């Protein structure tokens, strides 16, 4: 199966360039998985306090990463697909009222929620030698919903 | 008796000794010579360069996706990553007894899928996957006794001329220089002139 | 056998003895955030001082690269002093290391640690075990370092945990860029454009590649070095607005001084800090591992879970199957000897003849002060083999005397020992004088040769001197017991 | 590959390149792992020669016959060459661990040769009527079973060391398997060739 | 795709890992066949179409 | 033939930095090859309609 | 003769195989004769037969 996976990957690498931008952005995963369920492990909250999203994100962050390192586990996933995401719920009547479109919001989020590269201050080659080399640090990615608002 | 058969037949014992000697001489001539065998568990190094990015930015944006993709590769015990300003260095440790080439090709195949997520600059410079199980045979230092050649000149002379000849030598796995100063067309902006000309 | 156990208890164990490799690896670390011209000057002074040293033939310097953490730090440098050949120089590497530490012990700008080159590749620099404390809870690195400092405070008290250190360093100076987004958009600006100007003036911008000498080389854009060495560098940089107005960068961007990590290390998809500690001289390395593990458990929070790498991983992993393997190896030896002698009790004579070689080897290594290295274990394997060889031959000759010649048990034991005395002494003399030079070996690979030779010689002398007397005693006892059951 | 040959080729090629070097540019080789393996090979050769000489001396002293010294001079090199052939077949490489193991294996080989020859001589000198061939046959009938049992016991001691995993497991596996090969070859030689030569 | 579907713009930092940012219209505005009526797009003449 | 492709793939990926950008964008293909022409198959139309 | 020291010659395919395999037949012949002699000395227990 290892040689089979390697052959499939070698042949796939050429076609992945042809794929649409979104498809390759999400990635194309090749696994030696039998696609038949070996076993199902159900993680549940007896208190019922934790909602479905919180339980899914917990098992995704902690349990799944450990389980994938188990030898003999081709793929271990949870059915919910409820990973956290900063959902922005557009209101088309308000979009029309203020005059913006969905593309404007797309561009604004793509522009104002990315981290970029900023060099260091006082790096060589400089004629006036400075005592220290100081790195510039920026936080361009918003963290809270009150920040995306 | 077994020993009596050879005692009564000195020529048979002698030719057995001669054949053993010939096989031993052949093996001795063909025995690989090293300092130490592969005692250390095999490792695979993943490197990506995000020039001008801080350590935290690299850790969150380059280190996390590649590490997540590499997680799950077969025969992997533990995986470690160090993010420094400009560069991300990832070392995957595999269970001892794993073929280094199988591990390297596995990590390569995973990173092939993970690459498109990475920032544009990281993709443009590329992600480098190699096996670090090989040990150093030796170190050769090319130096300028006079001040005629700078670090740049020596490094580029070494990379263009010295390295190619050394890699052709039989038994040389690879030769790599450490200076990391390739030729580059440097454009040095002067903000006073930039503002003067608008 | 009790004294054997005591000697094994009072002999420290090490993985591989430190050796003189002909190279002294010197690690120079300036204060964090230091420029590279300072590192270059410090390395030049270090090299010029080492030129006075007679042993140090030449120096190889990697300025700007840190060897402790594989990463480019301008404040760091590694200098290797290439010593003369072992024959030429009288002083060993340890004496030169002591001299270097002595001349650089006084407080100065740079902290230089002079250590010997590792004996076997794949072993960490110095002897510090590798431990990673993953932070599940996602705390900031400044809090992770505070917790690690608490853990190091508790570990520093214990004598077992000598020289505990953490690579996690958050004291590097940094400039925090505070974007005024309201002002940024009020100026008709896109964040990507302003950060492209920052990346092209203060950082290097790799636009594309150009052909030179038949190879593609990068084209990098960066402002002049005199215009990016101060906190006010953002003053001269201008960005075009969408309204075609030149706008200075300091209008909506601010540089605020701060301190933070330079190397951000993540272990198994979680942020981590490396803990580097050395065992106590009396306690073993495994005891130090257990001690640091307990220290981290009691000091660190529930989020911090200790993960191990390298030497510690080998220590945890290796010892498990060795016990079962050795039990199986002894069971098979017993079965084979029983099949040879045609008696269940008799192999006990060979099995109890084995420990004399162990006794002698451990006694000689304890007296000379050599530790319980792996080469000592290999020497133990050889000594066990030879002691079992001699015991098997003596027991077989005793059995043949008792059965074929009809000699009495006492007489059979006497005659067997007398017969086997000459070959045992012959081979003992030959092999002992053969391995005698190993103790007085030359410089190249000296320590391993010394350890193996001293263990081997001790075991051989003990076997040839003592086991020859004791194997007949065991044969006499077991044969009398066998006669007892026959009655 | 052979480290020593490769290092020699690298040095020769570096000199050749240094012939066509710009003015002021030199080269040097600070670190070279071939030094350790060459020194180890020289030390092992010295140990082999010293052990052979001491075997000849002790044989000429205890046995009082010079013609007997020829037997170890043939038995020992044959055992060592057989060990080399088996090592090459199984895939081992000449490294520091295997050379250290060969230093030990010298002891096993000389022990076997001395044991067999001394037993032959004892039986020869016990009875004046017995002939050399009869003495050899009698002594081998005496010690043929013990030699096989010793070989099996030594192997049952050394093989379980190999199954140990980890860094120490591999390092000790080198010694253990070299010793097991050595005892097997030495026992076979002591059964077949040594009595014939005696 | 931004209104009726989910548009994956980029990632944002939460709990140490990276999590997606998705843009979609409210459930009531992508719920009928007439969903296209409420949604507008600006042309190159700055007219909401 | 399989292991050779693995080793070539590994070395090519190890030397990523040296490649120019255009080949990286299009991609580099490593595939087992064969110089052996087993046969040539000719497909032709009889009516000459195609 | 023509190209000179600036050029070296290299071979491919059958030419390469022949140039590299020059001498293998003689090596096999010598080893075969040696082993035939050794085996026949073993069986007949004489050196000159």
Residue numbers in the entry:
A (entry chain B): 100 to 248
B (entry chain C): 1 to 198
C (entry chain C): 546 to 1032
D (entry chain C): 298 to 495
E (entry chain B): 744 to 792
F (entry chain A): 100 to 149
G (entry chain A): 843 to 891
Provide excerpts from the study.
The most predominant and clinically important multidrug efflux system in C. jejuni is the CmeABC (Campylobacter multidrug efflux) pump, a tripartite system that includes an inner membrane transporter (CmeB), a periplasmic fusion protein (CmeA), and an outer membrane channel protein (CmeC). A recently identified CmeB variant, termed resistance enhancing CmeB (RE-CmeB), can increase its multidrug efflux pump activity, likely by influencing antimicrobial recognition and extrusion. The cryo-EM images of RE-CmeB without a bound ligand permitted us to resolve the structure of apo-RE-CmeB at a nominal resolution of 3.08 Å. This multidrug efflux pump adopts the overall architecture of RND-type proteins and forms a homotrimer.
We reconstituted purified RE-CmeB into lipidic nanodiscs and collected single-particle images of this pump using cryo-electron microscopy (cryo-EM). One of these structures depicted that the trimeric RE-CmeB pump does not contain any bound ligands. Interestingly, the cryo-EM structure of RE-CmeB depicts that this multidrug efflux pump forms an asymmetric trimer in which the three protomers display distinct conformational states. Similar to the structures of asymmetric AcrB, MtrDCR103 (30, 31), AdeB, and AdeJ, the three RE-CmeB protomers in our cryo-EM structure present the “access”, “binding”, and “extrusion” conformations, respectively. The entrance of the periplasmic cleft of RE-CmeB is encompassed by the amino acids Y658, L660, R710, and D823. A flexible F-loop (663PPIPGLSL670) is observed to connect the periplasmic entrance and the proximal multidrug-binding sites of RE-CmeB. A similar hydrophobic patch is found in RE-CmeB, and this RE-CmeB hydrophobic patch is composed of I178, L607, and F610.
